[PDB]
Amino acid sequence: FVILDDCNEKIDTELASHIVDLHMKRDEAIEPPFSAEQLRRYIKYARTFKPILTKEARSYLVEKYKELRKDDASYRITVRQLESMIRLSEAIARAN
Amino acid sequence: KVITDQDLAKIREVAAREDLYSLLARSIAPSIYELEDVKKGILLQLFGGTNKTFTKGGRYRGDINILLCGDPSTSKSQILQYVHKITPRGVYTSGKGSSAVGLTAYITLVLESGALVLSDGGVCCIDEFDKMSDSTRSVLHEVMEQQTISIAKAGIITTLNARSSILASANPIGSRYNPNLPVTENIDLPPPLLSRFDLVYLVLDKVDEKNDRELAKHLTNLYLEDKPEHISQDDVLPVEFLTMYISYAKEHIHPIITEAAKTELVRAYVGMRKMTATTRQLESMIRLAEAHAKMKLKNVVELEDVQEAVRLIRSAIKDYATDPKTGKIDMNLV
Numbered sequence: 001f002v003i004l005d006d007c008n009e010k011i012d013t014e015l016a017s018h019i020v021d022l023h024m025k026r027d028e029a030i031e032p033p034f035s036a037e038q039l040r041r042y043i044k045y046a047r048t049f050k051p052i053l054t055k056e057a058r059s060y061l062v063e064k065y066k067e068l069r070k071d072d073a074s075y076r077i078t079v080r081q082l083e084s085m086i087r088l089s090e091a092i093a094r095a096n
Numbered sequence: 097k098v099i100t101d102q103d104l105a106k107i108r109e110v111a112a113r114e115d116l117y118s119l120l121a122r123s124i125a126p127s128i129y130e131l132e133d134v135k136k137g138i139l140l141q142l143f144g145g146t147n148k149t150f151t152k153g154g155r156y157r158g159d160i161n162i163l164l165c166g167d168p169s170t171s172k173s174q175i176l177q178y179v180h181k182i183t184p185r186g187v188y189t190s191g192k193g194s195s196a197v198g199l200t201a202y203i204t205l206v207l208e209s210g211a212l213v214l215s216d217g218g219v220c221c222i223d224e225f226d227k228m229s230d231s232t233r234s235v236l237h238e239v240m241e242q243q244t245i246s247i248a249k250a251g252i253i254t255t256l257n258a259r260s261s262i263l264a265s266a267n268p269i270g271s272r273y274n275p276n277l278p279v280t281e282n283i284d285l286p287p288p289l290l291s292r293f294d295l296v297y298l299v300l301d302k303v304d305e306k307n308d309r310e311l312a313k314h315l316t317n318l319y320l321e322d323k324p325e326h327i328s329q330d331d332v333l334p335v336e337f338l339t340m341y342i343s344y345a346k347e348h349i350h351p352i353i354t355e356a357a358k359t360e361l362v363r364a365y366v367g368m369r370k371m372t373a374t375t376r377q378l379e380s381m382i383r384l385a386e387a388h389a390k391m392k393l394k395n396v397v398e399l400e401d402v403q404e405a406v407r408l409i410r411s412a413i414k415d416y417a418t419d420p421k422t423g424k425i426d427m428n429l430v
């Protein structure tokens with residue numbers, strides 16, 4: 001992941017407000033979707049799943065990998081990117 | 097170690113004076129001639145911001161870091177002496193005198209403390225900052241940003257607290273300020289480290305007969321007596337009472353942001369940003385405004401405090417005299 005400043009008034013005006021709110025109110029600003037002790041229980045539950053790759057997904061993966069190889073034809077895209085993509089898909093299915 | 101209602105009466109009465117800000121600033125280092133903005137910035141470092149801790153989302157530093165940069169003979173190191181003696185806790189050190197281990201912590205199986213750890217809650221004065229190597233200076237990134245020291249070596253792995261304020265002194269590349277280079281190239285610190293200072297000062301050895309006669313009369317007056325009674329100004333506070341004021345204000349006063357101050361801070365940040373100002377310029381402005389509020393024994397940050405914080409930042413780095421496009425300074429405007 002590469003992070004860059006990308007200066008823009010419409011973003012700066014909001015980001016400054018967010019930062020000043022954090023210094024103005026301690027706890028109140030964030031309002032997260034879930035409690036931390038709720039989220040950890042969910043993550044513990046999710047890690048019990050061991051999902052299996054569907055037939056259509058196997059057909060689809062090689063097409064997407066061919067697209068990456070043609071984009072590649074910047075770090076050069078190897079077989080390892082397919083293995084990594086499988087790992088990410090396993091994690092996504094587990095999240096759900 | 098080396099309260100009464102009368103003390104509180106004196107403190108409250110002094111805090112009501114109109115010339116308070118100038119009185120306090122010119123009284124931290126009485127025998128040093130002019131350099132008022134430098135003295136003001138150092139005073140606000142002494143007071144500090146407010147410390148903040150959340151239930152989640154972390155903790156935010158109250159401490160201010162300052163860098164003094166400019167020509168030789170300008171009396172930078174003399175100012176570091178005063179700060180080193182005023183502060184209750186702190187250390188003075190030199191660039192060629194310091195190793196990475198000595199500055200933080202030492203394996204000896206037992207762990208041992210370095211300068212930034214001994215200086216916790218105080219001010220750490222570093223002189224000849226431009227002489228120490230990139231290897232040694234890289235240690236300061238983590239301690240300045242987080243105020244913690246993480247260690248992971250054979251048989252010991254831990255994290256330590258370092259609520260330490262840095263006051264630094266350096267001379268530019270080429271050893272005298274060169275007006276044919278932009279300011280960032282004269283200062284020559286890398287951007288990840290230069291971004292971590294709240295205030296950066298340029299001080300310049302500009303020739304002027306008006307200035308020179310006053311300076312010469314001031315320094316020669318010290319030799320008219322064996323042990324001088326002479327002092328630069330008629331009204332200054334004794335060191336003991338000044339210490340009492342600063343200490344009490346640090347303990348009892350805790351300012352908060354007002355909505356008006358929030359609006360001005362957002363406006364001012366967008367003004368400096370739209371044109372380079374980073375996100376740290378916002379947080380340092382908040383911290384300076386809080387330090388200004390404590391110094392008046394107020395419980396709230398107001399519009400006046402925000403505007404003083406902005407003004408001092410613009411004044412320190414000679415921005416008004418800076419060419420906005422080329423980054424060089426017109427020496428005629430100084």
Ligand SMILES: Nc1ncnc2c1ncn2[C@@H]1O[C@H](COP(=O)(O)OP(=O)(O)NP(=O)(O)O)[C@@H](O)[C@H]1O
Nearest residue numbers: 127128129130167168169170171172173174175267
């Ligand atoms: N405004 C001033 N007020 C008082 N003394 C001054 C002033 N300007 C210069 N001096 C004197 O000039 C000398 C400055 O020495 P010093 O404090 O080392 O300056 P410096 O900024 O650290 N220069 P350098 O170490 O070469 O980078 C001391 O003797 C001071 O007393």
Ligand SMILES: [Mg+2]
Nearest residue numbers: 171172173174
């Ligand atoms: Mg010196």
